[PDB]
Every structure is written in C-alpha cells, then in structure tokens.
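Encode chain A's predicted structure.
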Amino acid sequence: SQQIATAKDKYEWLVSRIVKNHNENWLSVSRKMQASPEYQDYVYLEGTQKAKKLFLQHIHRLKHE
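Encoded structure for chain A:
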C-alpha cells in the first residue's frame, strides 16, 4: 500500500526538481510541474492545495531546514 509515501515522495522530488532556491511561486511551478504525471497523480490523490502546502514545506526547507 505504498502510494501515500512514494507518490508523495516522488512529487516531493518534483518540487525539488523544479523549486531549488524556493524563490519560485507555486502557481508558476505547478505550471511547470503539471506537465508531469508525477504532480498530476499526487494532486489527483491528495489535492492541489496540499501539493501547494507540500511545495510550501519544501520551500521552507529550502529556506531553512
């Protein structure tokens, strides 16, 4: 039952693969990300705002882990 982990984990890379310096903006990066089944799948399961929230997290981590 490894989807909650891996699909998120992968998506969490998707963020790290696009959003490096955190200076990005979610919408624009989801523009980017949406061209990837990765972002889709996760947003399909969980949600776009939670993927935003997920972006935010990583952002913070980028900012200061």
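Helices lie at 6-18, 26-33, 37-45, 48-64.
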